Design a protein around this ligand. Structure first.
Ligand code: CYC
Ligand code: CYC
Ligand code: CYC
Ligand code: CYC
Ligand code: CYC
Ligand code: CYC
Ligand code: CYC
Ligand code: CYC
Ligand code: CYC
Lengths: 50, 67, 160, 169, 36, 161, 160, 160, 161, 160, 161, 161
């Protein structure tokens, strides 16, 4: 799940680069913290995308 | 198409029909080849006795051109 | 034939032959020389087409030639090649008739439940007729290969 | 919107009948079951977020293609919409548990549900599987807790699956 | 100029793959592996 | 229906072989004759009603057949005979186009001699009507085309007679 | 019903049922036995309540039953007693449901327009319902009489 | 047209287009330029055929313009030439379409009932159409007129 | 229904005039485009079942539609969906041959939206199926024929939506 | 189920249920515990019946797992075994219901044109359900294997 | 139509899994009720016409409905009302045997309101007739099986509502 | 709605993979055509009254549609037809610059057939108006931009027909 989330983050980053609008990133990352923090480390995600 | 000249008699089993029923009791007919199987099965599950059947049109052993 | 279909259509409508189908009979009766050229080419070269098409079918789908398949053994592969000879003969009958009614009245009606009973995959039969069509089109002239391949891929479409 | 009392009153009004002993028995049975219905609804009031979260965490493992690409629960927007739908279903199931009648489910859940789900491509089979997962969780939690009557819990979810589900046989 | 023709030009075909059995058939994939 | 082409195909299929040169020559003959067949069919379709009307007018009208006491007296019998002659002309045109009389044997010559013998239809008068139709068509469509039309016409005349 | 009102009030603001609505539904459930007893004695005495209240109505308002009146005649008198029985049945429905919305939905929407089309004095219909209230309140305990007279006075307020 | 007729037949047998009908559509597509030339000549000269064939009709059948006739009168002869122009336009439509179904749909279905209600001799209208094909055959080249006269032939067969 | 030729003929007949120059130009355009349409119809009639096969494998197999509870779970539902795809492909071939989408209005799109709405059929899933039909057809049939088939199948999708 | 089938037949004849089918519903609800015992037998043996039946199918017809076959590859064999589990579930539903309607409405109507799109051999799926029948009779008791074999044989008859 | 057994099989089938323990409990509950259902169906099937006779005598006879001017006046309309009450009794017996009202939803209530409104059939009088059927059947069979019949008879009434 | 970029990203998202080999080609073709498509939009938006003027003058004026008895007789109907042609030109510009006809599907073709069949607007005359639009735009903007507008204008024409 973590590996496909990382590859999916990079995939949607490239898709937003192509689209020219970060709206896809905003929609698909705005509410993600509460669902992802139950079984995955939120600081590890921050350092990962960093 | 090749046709069947058939002759059969079908009796009534359920009702005593008070109208004239000889023409649809005993009849000689011309049925098509593709409909002959279902026509024979229809009258033969109905319960009639077929007395005669021939090929009115066409020839036996026709590989092509029977239509 | 095309003339047979025109006659039975005019008889079913209870009328004389229409101008369009009369012109079709005239153009077919002029182009019959080219149609018989396609016919004599196919009859002269019939054996190499079915041999190459059977070999290409066998390498494409080896489950037929595999044990447990529909044609296991040399006599059953020869029976499959004989069926391909029958289909090529029906294609020649179609291109000399100018219409697909000989292929209907010999080798198209009931063929699905025929190969259902035999256990033969009719999609693999369609693949065999595709191989026959492409080897024949590679062999003979392209302007005539289009006319032959129209009847070939009608046979393919009815197989599939 | 009708509860059991309202639908019994409507059924007797249609025939123009006064309420007889059978109607008194039905209302009496509803009134003694009402304490258990209140207890079950107050139970699922507390745990509802955990119920919908574990319902998603079971449904997306029974059918894992919902969270793979080309599944309808792929993105987190679709995920939050699906969890909001499950919260809707649990809220109206609480309403039907209180009302002891599924007319609230019919009127406010099911009358356009196939239309919306076919319009937006939303599957119905995984949805009713999530309904039955929620039903099994509420039944197990009621069996674990001190609930004397647990038979009425499965009725609104089974009604929702029967009404929403495509007729197989 | 003639590079206006995006839609009116020759279309670029996409490479669209056939859908495969998914993770709901992991049990049957393991079963087929032990079948071999 | 059996034509020249389907006859070639069936004569190949009865032994299961392909088309040889012997079956090729008659097919080439049919391809050579087909243009004349289409031209004759176009002329016959152009004058289909007028041939029947003119042959009826100079063959059997004002005679004992259409007189009272004749078979063709009543207007119903007259319309039936006109329909029969139009059917003979149209189906003989079909046979002329197809190159074979199997269409006549399968559609017209199927239980018609016994029907005419039962109904009392005059065989000699139908023979005279068929000959009048044949000579009018031979005068109209040409010499060789009219003779080739008359081959099927007197074939069906001998079949009905 | 009270259950219907509580569920509707929760659903309008899109939440689960509040503790206040749970307490209200609990009070409804606990008072269900007394409400069922009130409805049972009303439907048991449904004939004598209509009879005595119709007698008191026709003594107090002879104009509606005198010739020229709306209910003059035995058929129209029986129809008036049928209307009184209808409203007593709706009162029993409201007593069972714990509120006034079945009476409102069945026999109190468009009642003024209906009786205006019929030519019936709506104040005399309200007097009939008031006599039903008095006769029924004489047939129960004091709290039961007050509880049933609440629904009766709702019908009085909707008619006048 | 012939395309619509072939599509209707293929839909009736619930199948795709046979290669014979594909060949007939292909040959119609290749040979449509001659039909366009024929229709262009007819619409260029469309008053001349109506003029000469109306003159020849009034010569051969002067009972038409005799008193007591259907087309006796100036306006009646104008409507006669109007019908001739209608049938000429329909023949151009049929030549363009390559099949006679537009002619049948516009001006050959119910023509007997129409002219029976109008009192018009249908064989005299057939004579007028035959004279139109005579004038058009005189006006056009030999093969083009031989191809274009078959639509006139179908009109003659339906009307007479 | 009508083709492009009969559309021109019907428009000229409604106007009451003969075929003018622009009508001749449109007819010449259709006669220019006819050969590609004929060979495209031959290709699609060859690959009729296989286009449906790879399209449904491209879009709908191993999905929620064919999973239990979806509208293609049972065998009769699968057979009905394959029947619908065959109908759409055959009528799109007919519209491609005619050069007009009138047959789609007369035969297909006249009541099919209400039919699917009564049946509970997911029109989004059918739209994705017809997009897969577009892709597989344009893969096999060429470029301009792919454009024509895509236009008529998108017309079917627009009638569904 | 048997109740639905009997009601359908009685409704088709427009009559009530005869005491014969009433006695069969009596016998069915007495033997419900037994037929549920076969139901939990197959439910417990779900992952084993189709395991041995798939092994026997693959050793009997190796063309299925051969290259070019319908079920070549791990993914395709997993889909094949999913179809095995689907049909075993349908047979479980049939022996639960006491009638073949839940089998035939889900997995038997349109199955031929369902699998001809996928190229799946119908006789091979029939042989697969044969091996399901023998494995179920192997690890299940005799007379109840005869009852389950009745519905398995109905699957064989409707499929092959 | 669906009984309790086919409802359970449907609910498990659209999930794609086998019958779990709750399904077993529902089936055992239906098999427990099946004895009473079969006995009640046998009693109703025996005394089918007597129930309709008693209900018609209780609710419809000697009223304005069967008087001149009413819709049960003409004897074809009387026999139609008898046939309708036999319909309601037989399909209520069917729904009792199934344990579900899907048979009434599919064949009884399918446009019955539109049918009765087009014919002019009194909805209130036929609701009272079904009520009389319910009372006579509950008197004939018992409290529990009469209540079970009355559930589907009131379902037919509320469909007529 | 969606455009070519959204279609590419949606297809790649359904696949779950990146933009590997042909999505990049479609995007670079779109961005290569984009500046000239914007220039064509500038020309059409600047001259937009002239295109509908020459289109109505070329195709629909001096006809049965504009004379009494026609669908463009009254001034309200004429101004509505002018506004409809402006709608067609503007939404064709929208689809031409988006690179996808989804805007035509969701805001034009969703209800155009039903509003024209309810109103009585001649479909063939509307098609001729859009054809006059597409040749006027091809003359006024260029051959390549004329074809890039004309594919969407012919999509609207196919939606009409
Ligand atoms: C003198 C009046 C002015 C003049 C007139 C002029 N008008 C047109 C063209 C048209 N005008 C109309 C108007 C109507 N048709 C109707 O049915 C009604 C309501 C009753 C109106 C108002 C129409 C339809 C046309 C188009 C012709 C057609 O029937 O298709 C023109 C021609 C312009 C052109 O470009 O063709 C002219 C010249 N012009 C003036 O300057 C005078 C002030
Ligand atoms: C020339 C184009 C033809 C013509 C047209 C005509 N149109 C109308 C009126 C309407 N057109 C529409 C259509 C749309 N509205 C939208 O918002 C959109 C998408 C952006 C479309 C496509 C509608 C809704 C109407 C009715 C109300 C309105 O004016 O918008 C009319 C008038 C009908 C009447 O009788 O009033 C006409 C005449 N008619 C022709 O003959 C030309 C072929
Ligand atoms: C009674 C005088 C003798 C006799 C009777 C008998 N009849 C039948 C059955 C049939 N009778 C007919 C006759 C006619 N149908 C018509 O339409 C007409 C003209 C109006 C006639 C004369 C037919 C067709 C039948 C066949 C059945 C039917 O009803 O259509 C039977 C046989 C009944 C059966 O098939 O089981 C018998 C025995 N036999 C005698 O011994 C009496 C002296
Ligand atoms: C922990 C370091 C990593 C991690 C693991 C993880 N992921 C999930 C499940 C989900 N991940 C997502 C994420 C996304 N939604 C989007 O739209 C996008 C692109 C912008 C992403 C990346 C979602 C929605 C889920 C839930 C769906 C599912 O169940 O798979 C889990 C499971 C959570 C749980 O079991 O409660 C875990 C443990 N996620 C990270 O970001 C780190 C890389
Ligand atoms: C006079 C009112 C109209 C008319 C007459 C006309 N009649 C004929 C010739 C024939 N008419 C018939 C029809 C009949 N057969 C019958 O049995 C009966 C009575 C029941 C009728 C009316 C027949 C058979 C002939 C042919 C005569 C024969 O015996 O062969 C003609 C001659 C046609 C020709 O081409 O020579 C004519 C002119 N014509 C009119 O214009 C008057 C309106
Ligand atoms: C005309 C040359 C002479 C003649 C003819 C005549 N024919 C009939 C009536 C019928 N003839 C047939 C036979 C056919 N059926 C077919 O399908 C075909 C073509 C393949 C034929 C030839 C039929 C069915 C009839 C109708 C039978 C009926 O009467 O219902 C009649 C009428 C006989 C009568 O009694 O009415 C006549 C007079 N006889 C002559 O004298 C003309 C010279
Ligand atoms: C396949 C793309 C998707 C889909 C299809 C589906 N359709 C049905 C059932 C029917 N579809 C029709 C439609 C038509 N009527 C026509 O006249 C034509 C041709 C012009 C069509 C295409 C009809 C009438 C039916 C009803 C047939 C019937 O009564 O069985 C089903 C079956 C649903 C069922 O049997 O309950 C299905 C599954 N649905 C999907 O999910 C696929 C994505
Ligand atoms: C295994 C015994 C044989 C085999 C099977 C095989 N099947 C498929 C694909 C599908 N089979 C079905 C059939 C059903 N789905 C149902 O829900 C039911 C009833 C409960 C049935 C009968 C379906 C729908 C599919 C499509 C996959 C999907 O579910 O979306 C395949 C795969 C073919 C492919 O192209 O992927 C295979 C291999 N093949 C054999 O040779 C064995 C004899
Ligand atoms: C007298 C000759 C016999 C007889 C009669 C009898 N009839 C009834 C009851 C009813 N009969 C009818 C019949 C009709 N209604 C119509 O409108 C017409 C045609 C114009 C007919 C024939 C009806 C409707 C009834 C029901 C009465 C009602 O109006 O409700 C009875 C009463 C049976 C009961 O149980 O009440 C009797 C006694 N009985 C005989 O023995 C004589 C042979």
């Amino acid at each position: 799940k973590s590996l496909r989330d990382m590859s999916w983050f990079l995939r949607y980053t490239t898709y937003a680069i192509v689209a020219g609008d970060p709206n896809i990133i905003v929609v698909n990352t705005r509410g993600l913290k509460e669902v992802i923090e139950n079984a995955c480390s939120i600081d590890a995600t921050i350092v990962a995308i960093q | 198409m090749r046709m069947f000249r058939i002759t059969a008699c079908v009796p009534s089993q359920t009702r005593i029909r008070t109208q004239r029923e000889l023409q649809n009791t005993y009849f000689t007919k011309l049925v098509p080849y593709d409909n002959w199987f279902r026509e024979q099965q229809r009258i033969m599950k109905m319960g009639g006795k077929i007395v005669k059947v021939e090929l009115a049109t066409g020839r036996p052993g026709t590989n092509a051109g029977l239509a | 034939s095309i003339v047979t279909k025109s006659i039975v259509n005019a008889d079913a409508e209870a009328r004389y032959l229409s101008p369009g189908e009369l012109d079709r009979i005239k153009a077919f009766v002029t182009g019959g020389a080219a149609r018989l050229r396609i016919a004599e080419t196919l009859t002269g070269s019939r054996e190499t087409i079915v041999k190459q098409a059977g070999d290409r079918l066998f390498q494409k789908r080896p489950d037929i030639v595999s044990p447990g398949g529909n044609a296991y053994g040399e006599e059953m592969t020869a029976t499959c090649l004989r069926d391909m000879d029958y289909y090529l003969r029906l294609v020649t009958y179609g291109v000399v008739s100018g219409d697909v009614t000989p292929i209907e009245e010999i080798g198209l009606v009931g063929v699905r439940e025929m190969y259902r009973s035999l256990g033969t995959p009719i999609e693999a039969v369609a693949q065999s007729v595709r191989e026959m069509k492409e080897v024949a089109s590679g062999l003979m002239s392209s302007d005539d290969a289009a006319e032959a391949s129209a009847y070939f891929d009608f046979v393919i479409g009815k197989m599939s | 919107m009708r509860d059991a009392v309202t639908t019994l009153i409507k059924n007797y009004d249609l025939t123009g009948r006064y309420l007889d002993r059978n109607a008194m028995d039905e209302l009496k049975a509803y009134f003694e079951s009402g304490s258990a219905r209140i207890a079950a609804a107050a139970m699922i009031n507390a745990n509802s977020a955990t119920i919908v979260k574990r319902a998603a965490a079971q449904l997306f493992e029974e059918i894992p293609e919902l969270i793979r690409p080309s599944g309808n629960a792929y993105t987190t927007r679709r995920f939050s919409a699906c969890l909001r739908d499950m919260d809707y279903y649990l809220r109206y199931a609480s309403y039907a548990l209180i009302a002891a009648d599924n007319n609230v489910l019919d009127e406010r859940v099911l009358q356009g549900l196939r239309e919306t789900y076919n319009s937006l491509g939303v599957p119905i089979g995984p949805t009713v599987r999530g309904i039955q997962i929620m039903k099994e969780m509420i039944e197990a939690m009621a069996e674990d807790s001190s609930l004397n009557s647990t038979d009425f819990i499965a009725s609104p979810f089974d009604h929702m699956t029967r009404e929403l589900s495509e007729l197989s046989v | 100029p003639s590079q206006v023709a995006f839609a009116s030009g020759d279309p670029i075909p996409q490479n669209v793959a056939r859908r495969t059995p998914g993770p709901s058939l992991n049990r049957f994939k393991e079963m087929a592996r032990q079948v071999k | 229906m059996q034509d020249a082409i389907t006859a070639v195909i069936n004569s190949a299929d009865v032994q299961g072989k392909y088309l040889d040169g012997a079956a090729m020559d008659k097919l080439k003959s049919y391809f050579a004759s087909g243009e004349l067949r289409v031209r004759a069919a176009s002329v016959i379709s152009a004058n289909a009603a007028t041939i029947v009307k003119e042959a009826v007018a100079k063959s059997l009208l004002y005679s004992d057949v259409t007189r009272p006491g004749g078979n063709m007296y009543t207007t119903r019998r007259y319309a039936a005979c006109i329909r029969d002659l139009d059917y003979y002309l149209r189906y003989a045109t079909y046979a002329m186009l197809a190159g074979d009389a199997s269409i006549l044997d399968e559609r017209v010559l199927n239980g018609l001699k016994e029907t005419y013998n039962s109904l009392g239809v005059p065989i000699s008068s139908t023979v005279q009507a068929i000959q009048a139709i044949k000579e009018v068509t031979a005068s109209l469509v040409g010499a060789d085309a009219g003779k080739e039309m008359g081959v099927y016409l007197d074939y069906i005349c001998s079949g009905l007679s």
